[PDB]
Amino acid sequence: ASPLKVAVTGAAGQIGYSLLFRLASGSLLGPDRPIELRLLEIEPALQALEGVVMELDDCAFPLLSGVEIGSDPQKIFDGVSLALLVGARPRGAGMERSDLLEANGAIFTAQGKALNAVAADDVRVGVTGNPANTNALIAMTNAPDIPRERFSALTRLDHNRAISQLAAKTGAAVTDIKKMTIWGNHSATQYPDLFHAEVAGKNAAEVVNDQAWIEDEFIPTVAKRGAAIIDARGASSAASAASATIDAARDWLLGTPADDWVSMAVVSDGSYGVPEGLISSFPVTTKGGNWTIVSGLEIDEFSRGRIDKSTAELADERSAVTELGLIA
Site of interaction with its own copies (CB under 8 A): 12, 17-18, 20-22, 25, 27, 47-48, 50-52, 54-62, 157, 160-161, 163-164, 167-168, 173-175, 177, 225, 228-229, 231-234, 237-240, 242-244, 247
Element (H, E) at 36: strand 35-40
- CA-nearest of 16, 15, 73 to 40 is 73
DSSP characters for 69-103?
EES-HHHHTTT-SEEEE--SPPP-TT--GGGGHHH
User: Considering CB distances under 5 to 8 angstroms, the limit depending on partner class, which of Na ion, its own copies, none binds residue 126?
Assistant: Na ion
Question: Measured from the CB atom, is 22 or 203 closer to Na ion?
Answer: 22
Active-site option among 5, 156, 159, 186: 186
User: Considering CB distances under 5 to 8 angstroms, the limit depending on partner class, which of Na ion, its own copies, none binds residue 315?
Assistant: Na ion
Within 10 Å of residue 215's Cβ, how many Cβ atoms?
12
Nearest position to Na ion, beta carbon: 277
Express the helix, strand and coil content of the chain in percent, nearest 5 each.
Answer: 45, 20, 35
CA torsion 173-211-182-253 (nearest 10°) is 30
Is 186 catalytic? The answer is: yes
Residue in 111, 134, 152, 263 binding Na ion, rule: CB under 5 A: 152
- 187: CB partners within 8 A, 6+ apart: 96, 97, 98, 131, 223, 310, 313
Question: Measured from the CB atom, is 17 or 302 closer to its own copies?
Answer: 17
Active site residues per annotation: 186
Q: Which residues bind Na ion (CB under 5 A)?
A: 9-10, 12-15, 17-18, 26, 28-29, 33, 40, 54, 57, 59, 68-69, 87, 126, 140, 143, 146, 148-149, 151-152, 154, 157, 160, 215, 219, 221, 224-228, 238, 240, 243-244, 247-248, 266-267, 270, 275-277, 292-293, 312, 315-316
